[PDB]
Symmetry: D2
Subunit: 421 residues, 4 copies
């Protein structure tokens, strides 16, 4: 019954028929005969999963092994929340095993932390650290700063002019004018002190603001564009070269994030009694400190590290981020961490530990946190979506949990390194 | 209905009954008030999936919102390959949308690149970069170096002693003995030149070797332990402080990975016709160059970046890594990239572009690549598993694809920023 | 004689002036007089230096080592008890001149203290291409010396509490008052702080008139922290410098926040001047600048070293002008940019940006007269009464401009090959 | 000749757009010509120039010479280092620097002295070349990594001078660029000129094999010379040195006015954690640069190389039976230094080198005087670290 191209095409152009009245083979025949662009399937096909299905069938016949997608799942997933929002040219989804570490005893609460990973022993090891913390009387944490950033680059005709623009942005009245434009774009937009850097006739401007419970890239970028249109009214010779001049800095290693912070800056701490260090972690405080000093400080220093003074913060950050619908590529900077270990108590046998993470780039609204499975892991922690009565409290609480879980991970791994084998 | 626990323990310890004869609520009554821990539920329960269900039921009772897990899926997933290998305390899986970006024309072949992301526009943006590359005669790439590392820290009583060890490791005879011990642990263990660094009585030793198509952490760590054991025979006063002293460096930013490389060092390039830059990319060669210089070089430099001279290599690396079963936490170093752009061709109006990525930590055997869904994405690229006839070729080919896709991604985002929205 | 000379020292009116070199030395070597009691006894300075040298020479494996180390006819009254100790002489560093440097409508003759052959010549040629291109323009973007003490509290909860308190309007005010009350020029600008667990690193920043500022800022810092201790008695002042300043070590914080004077400088060199003076083209200069000072420094893992040889110029000027040459570590931070300019993109636009020039025209080695002469050549010696800090700012601009002259010349030579 | 003219007459000849037979008079006449351009022409009055030996300076160390700058020189010592005693000259104008370093020497002396070792030794130059394509630059890297490619490059490099002896190459690609780090010992000279000449002929030989290669610049900043760079910290440059000492508890208390415990706490939290929060690469120390700079000016070194030469990590630990003694070490991977050439050619500079017993070439073992000076520098840096850190902890 597969009809000729010309007949299939009239059915397609017929608005009370459409693709729903053609078979997969007929649509594919139309695509291979160059009557439909391979990507405009998503508009023509009236169901999301069939769109995916036909794209897979088309993709398959181009591969060296036609059956390579057999075990890539696609059926019965909620593509409604993904198409035109989270992903394109969708051919399925990738299941990432989710484990749980906890309870994490943090700020007199208890958290069951979801961790999506394929690295064996990471969840178990993280769970052991949680245990040491819990029996040690818990951890305490504080958010020290909060504000996503965007660092556009603009160019003036001369460096004397860029200098003029910088000095102008630093006057109370010049800043206030830029602040008004930025803050007008959203209810959470609240431009903080500006940070600028001249390189010749370039000027890098680092816009920073809270963003409620959203991670904030989009909002900040909208506030930035409006802020710059306003600056351009005062300086019409200014050229806006790029809305991002890598001065943010987003998803690249950069000392500015380490020193100034980006997103949430957090510190977490705990004192593990000697007894717990022995029974849970199978070592002594002395051996843990000797390793922390010579690995996480001296080792990282010999390797030429900026911000990597920790054992495996990235493991925890990455696992939580994938689980909780974060942007996993932001683990580059969000993993920044210095882990400190000191002797405590009357005989120096208790272990004071802290982790400091100045650039946790996190959110509980928007992006991947819109998807229901990701929301389940957020609900687990009690941080899903916006916080009505105290905006930001859910993103802040998630950042504290990330730092606290990183600390658990540091305890366990460092203990294992200290003992051996 | 639930019966006394003592009777439940007879039924469980009975070899021809087991947990199958007990109820959900019965297993749970036994977990509460001890007898079974919770993680050993797997090594105890009839099926993997029922272990997950029991674990979810236990977890749910501890949460402030009992229905939190409702949309976290878990049924019909292949847990057999996960339990004891890739994750612990498993409560389900996290679906990550997977899109396809291609064809990527690389080294006179074509690749359909799977990307697992929740960032809107990322896959479409990358696909546009692939298209511009495709129309410009395609991309070329080369693997420059290959060797996973591990960087233990050892201590001697004095710095004069650590110096003696460093000097002995630098003789031909000293290295040969260490190499023999290292190489005996595995067929792929072939120790390359040692890199050593002293900090007083500390000595950091960076062991480097290829590892077939495996990412190679496990294998190198194994080789390192036997090498250090051999070294201790010659220097009995040496203490091995930690098998990783952060000198490797794994999952933390470090100039050593940027300078010496880690895993695969790759370069990719292409020339995009001036016509394509206008039609496909909506900008000019002159505009692309000016953005690249002032964003990816000058901007990254003003930010204090080591290795982050790029627009968003982390986006592409992260998405390929999740889709293909890599360790996503390694995006920290694997994202290291310098993107360069200049004028090319007769008119000098065509865009030359290269991406250099010195530390792509990757593999097609082990960890997450043992799972079937992530194997499907590896099969798309033709790089699933070990290459019998040419060990390591698959992992090398995957690194080349990553670098090329990164360049595609760099091309499209840099155009969008250059066009000004 | 041993006992006869002892009676001469003890007589308040006589003194060691009535003794010879050999006599004092006999006293020390027989253990009649402790050797450390020579600064106090000997009344004159050059003779002190001379006796110290003679005593020292007997302990060297070559007693004639100091033959050619000069020490005579130098003003040790401005050195003793201020700039140097256990002084045995002075080290002459050749001073050459590069100029005229046409900077902000003025013309400077820049003194450069060095022993590297061709450095003054090359820098001179840079100045010459700048002069034939219409001069250079510069601006001071910021000014403020820092000191970055480390304090600790019993817990990270406590350090976080202190950090929030210092960020309140009221808390800053109280700290600013204690800091500002130590000196006329001490005016505390915003604080920059970082927590590392129960540690708190506090970066105090302030202008300092025409002085480099180290001492002044360090005294203001101490009184400020004393005030903080009244609000937080559990706070331990671990060290007045916790390396957060950061002084005399490489540090991204100086590169990003600045330290001392942050400065920019620029110029345009006509195509003809690049060919005839610099022996290259604009196209070649740009090419080398991109691939050496940006890409090359990037491949080497540089923070703040995006330049050819700013350190050469900074160092030479610093030694000549009585600066703390050790501060060349941070003061040399520099990014050099080069792009095409003019009608047919044939002119060379150049700029240097130096965010952490640590500098002064008053205090320390700028108190010595030879150093003051070099400062006077530039017209920046000492404090500016009508506009505090102006002489220090001017010098910073001259360093940045001279650096640019140097980059122009050296890059031209590298490009020509 | 010019002797049969006057100062005013030669100057009148120079102004009219139209040589002298004594060096000191050339300097006088240059000062007088320059005086005409300054707003205060009497500013030069107290810049000395008389009775200095300009014969070794002109056409070697400085051009357009108008005089010299006296820098005060103090002595820190004795420094007990590797069973010898050194009287270290330090040229500085920073009050207390020499007195403080001197206290550190004293503490080291009373703890049985310091021990040092040179871990690596070779000056570098890091040219940048480009090739048509990244594929061609990759091919050149592969070629340079073969034993046969390296041998031909080595032969070419080693032909340029006595001491040219090429060690392992280090390379990095950036697209069609290739950065090639050449490393070699250079006798007792710092060696820049020697390595640059060697590098030129090596690159010339490379061009024979790869005709499409362009030599963009003899230094592509990959060396790296006189700029901060992680490559020097990780690979070393010039002399890599380590030094150490154990200071008895009693001596930490009586001389340094503190305790081993307090010293350790400040070192960890200042030199490690603080430098780390500041974003430091290689600056894990209190003030190595004060010492390096002071010794460098006094001993005729290139003071601009304090940028890389000051790289230092200072470590401190508890030591001894009762864990009350202070183990201290400093590690300096990139001391760029020499005892022949440059400012070491001058007699006053040679005076300070002779105090140390390292002046000029070591005829027995070429390069041994430079190694010794690096060891002394690392030892004196450790002295300075000890004292300043004790002052901060106290
Ligand atoms: C947390 C995971 C699971 C973990 C553990 C770990 O925590 N194990 C572990 C403990 C208790 C309870 C159960 C368990 O599985 C250990 C380890 C350390 C010692 C003895 C034995 C194992 C290692 C391990 C580490 C380093 C090595 F050289 C070899 C192995 N890793 C892998 C960590 C990597 O993803 C990052 C790491 O490379 C970062 C770094 O340190 O540079
Ligand atoms: C999702 C893609 C990768 C994407 C695109 C993009 O490729 N879009 C795009 C494609 C085809 C055709 C048209 C189109 O607009 C753009 C973009 C850039 C210009 C105009 C408009 C949008 C932006 C974007 C960039 C910067 C902003 F300030 C706001 C948005 N992003 C997000 C990039 C981030 O994940 C990393 C980024 O933060 C890294 C950095 O540059 O620092
Ligand atoms: C300014 C000095 C005097 C200078 C010049 C220079 O500018 N010469 C010069 C010009 C006009 C007029 C007279 C003259 O002597 C040159 C040079 C470069 C090419 C051709 C010819 C010379 C070189 C030189 C540089 C690199 C080499 F590999 C060999 C030599 N140097 C030494 C610079 C160093 O102190 C710093 C340098 O190492 C920093 C870096 O680039 O990484
Ligand atoms: C060695 C010099 C002379 C020295 C000493 C010093 O060691 N003094 C000293 C000792 C024995 C014997 C006599 C004496 O004068 C001290 C100091 C520190 C505490 C109490 C007392 C003094 C300070 C000092 C340091 C920091 C301050 F915030 C205020 C002062 N400085 C200046 C050092 C600078 O050039 C570099 C420094 O900034 C590097 C850094 O630490 O970040």
């Amino acid at each position: 019954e597969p009809r000729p191209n010309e007949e299939c095409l009239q059915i397609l152009g017929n608005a009370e028929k459409g693709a729903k009245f053609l078979s997969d083979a007929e649509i594919i025949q139309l695509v291979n005969a160059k009557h439909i662009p391979a990507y405009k399937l998503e508009t023509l096909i009236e169901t999301h999963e069939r769109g995916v299905s036909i794209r897979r069938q088309l993709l398959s016949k181009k591969l060296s092994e036609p059956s390579s997608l057999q075990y890539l799942p696609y059926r019965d997933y909620n593509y409604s929340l993904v198409m035109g929002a989270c992903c394109e040219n969708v051919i399925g989804y990738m299941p990432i095993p989710v484990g749980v570490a906890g309870p994490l005893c943090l700020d007199e609460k208890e958290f069951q932390v979801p961790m999506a990973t394929t690295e064996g022993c990471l969840v178990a090891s993280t769970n052991r650290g949680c245990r040491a913390i819990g029996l040690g009387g818990g951890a305490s944490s504080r958010v020290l700063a909060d504000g996503m950033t965007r660092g556009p680059v603009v160019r003036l005709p001369r460096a004397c002019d860029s200098a003029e623009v910088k000095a102008w942005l630093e006057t109370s009245e010049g800043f206030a004018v830029i602040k008004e434009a930025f803050d007008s774009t959203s209810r959470f937009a609240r431009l903080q002190k500006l940070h600028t850097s001249i390189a010749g006739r370039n000027l890098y401007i680092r816009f920073q603001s809270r963003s409620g419970d959203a991670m904030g890239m989009n909002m900040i970028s909208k506030g930035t564009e409006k802020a710059l249109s306003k600056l351009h009214e005062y300086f019409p010779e200014m050229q806006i070269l790029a809305v991002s001049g890598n001065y943010c800095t987003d998803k690249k290693p950069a000392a500015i994030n380490w020193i100034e912070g980006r997103g949430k800056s957090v510190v977490c701490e705990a004192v593990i009694p000697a007894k717990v260090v022995r029974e849970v972690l199978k070592t002594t405080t002395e051996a843990m400190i000797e390793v922390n000093i010579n690995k996480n400080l001296v080792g990282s220093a010999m390797a030429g590290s900026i911000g990597g003074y920790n054992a495996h913060a990235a493991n925890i950050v990455t696992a939580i981020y994938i689980a909780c619908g974060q942007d996993a590529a932001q683990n580059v900077g969000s993993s920044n961490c210095i882990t400190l270990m000191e002797a405590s108590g009357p005989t120096n046998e208790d272990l004071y530990i802290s982790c400091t993470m100045p650039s946790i780039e996190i959110g509980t609204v928007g992006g991947g946190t819109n998807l229901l499975p990701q929301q389940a892991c957020l609900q687990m922690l009690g941080v899903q979506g916006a916080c009505k009565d105290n905006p930001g409290e859910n993103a802040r609480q998630l950042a504290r949990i990330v730092c606290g879980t990183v600390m658990a991970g540091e305890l366990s791994l460092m203990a294992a390194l200290a003992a051996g084998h």
